[PDB]
Amino acid sequence: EASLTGAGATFPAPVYAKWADTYQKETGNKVNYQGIGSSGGVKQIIANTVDFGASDAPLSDEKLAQEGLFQFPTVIGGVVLAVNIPGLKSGELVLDGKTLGDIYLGKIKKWDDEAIAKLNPGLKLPSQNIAVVRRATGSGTSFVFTSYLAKVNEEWKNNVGTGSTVKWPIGLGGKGNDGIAAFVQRLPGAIGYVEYAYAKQNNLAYTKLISADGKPVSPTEENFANAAKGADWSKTFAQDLTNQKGEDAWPITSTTFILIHKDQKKPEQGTEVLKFFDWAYKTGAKQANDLDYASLPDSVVEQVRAAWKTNIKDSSGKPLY
């Protein structure tokens, strides 16, 4: 029986927590996961204060080598826009990239604006003020969201850019994916970006979006998976899943990563960390789908196992997988 600690991204916390609970019920091993945001996860693993870190933003090959870290992907999720709009039911409103960016730039202030009406011919939109919400500190969800905005709105790209943190043009700060969810729920007229599970599990309304190919698409497990169908995983785990071509490709999709040290000074802990994740790939797919996270293809989990044998070892150089 092992006692393990992980910390980082809130984007996948719902599935890591469920995996952890089930794993304990079946093997007795205990995994404690702290959802503190991707930046804190990177800082904590580098500081050796946790057995494993978690970040939705991938570290470059050079940064990994500099810190003696190894990175591997777990699941595929999707970022959606949770909204609190009077009269409209969930999934009713459609936004495109350009207009979404204009809302986040503060150019569009009301829900019945001409640009939103044009995208929604049949809807009776309210004259409600839009209340924009965003993340309070360094966030992996913010990284994928701003990575998307920079591709579809040039003004955003040139003045604000992409990052785990950016100089937000407008918007109240919410802490964690759960904080943005709670803000949307209490604020009539609100719009906030969150990983899908955070909107669905809290019964929040969300919008549809226009794919890179120009078609309206709904956010679903299958549609997040579709956005990764063209990913050449064999080249690198650090795949960009925003604004991808293809039928029913959710435009704001992303995978997420686990970081661990290659030279394990507590080899028993590392050995157990790998067993937890392997068990998850082997048996946890139903738990991931129940939460609407798409599973990585078997080919990718095989890449991860092969890489574990080659990179994770004790101080004498013995492989831990």
Which residues line the annotated binding site for phosphate? Answer: 9-11, 38, 56, 139-141
Total residues interacting with Cl ion, rule: CB under 5 A = 6
Comparing CB distances to Cl ion, the nearer of 10 and 303 is 10
For Cl ion, which residue of 110, 157, 175, 305 counts as binding (CB under 5 A)? 175
Residue 165 binding Cl ion, by CB under 5 A: no
Residue 200 binding Cl ion, by CB under 5 A: no
Quote the distance between the C-alpha of residue 317 and its chain's center: 34
Residue set of the binding site: 9-11, 38, 56, 139-141
Residue 193: its H or E element? strand 190-195
Which range touches Cl ion (CB under 5 A), out of 68-76, 83-91, 156-164, 176-184?
176-184
| Long-range contacts of the stretch 290-293 (C-beta < 8 A, 24+) | 290/18, 291/14, 291/15, 291/18, 291/197, 291/201, 292/77, 292/78, 292/196, 292/197, 292/200, 292/220, 292/221, 292/224, 293/12, 293/15, 293/75, 293/76, 293/77, 293/197, 293/221, 293/224
Residue 136 binding Cl ion, by CB under 5 A: yes
Comparing CB distances to Cl ion, the nearer of 163 and 267 is 163
Task: Supply the minimum distance, in Å, between the C-beta of residue 166 and Cl ion.
Answer: 13
Q: Residue 98 to residues 158, 192, 196: CA-CA distances in angstroms?
A: 14, 16, 21
For Cl ion, which residue of 50, 130, 135, 183 counts as binding (CB under 5 A)? 135
Task: Supply the minimum distance, in Å, between the C-beta of residue 179 and Cl ion.
Answer: 6
Residue 137 binding Cl ion, by CB under 5 A: yes
Q: How far apart are alpha carbons 105 and 84 in whole angstroms? A: 19
Bridge partners, residue 61, by sequence: none
Residue 261 binding Cl ion, by CB under 5 A: no
| Contact positions vs Cl ion (CB under 5 A) | 37, 135-137, 175-176
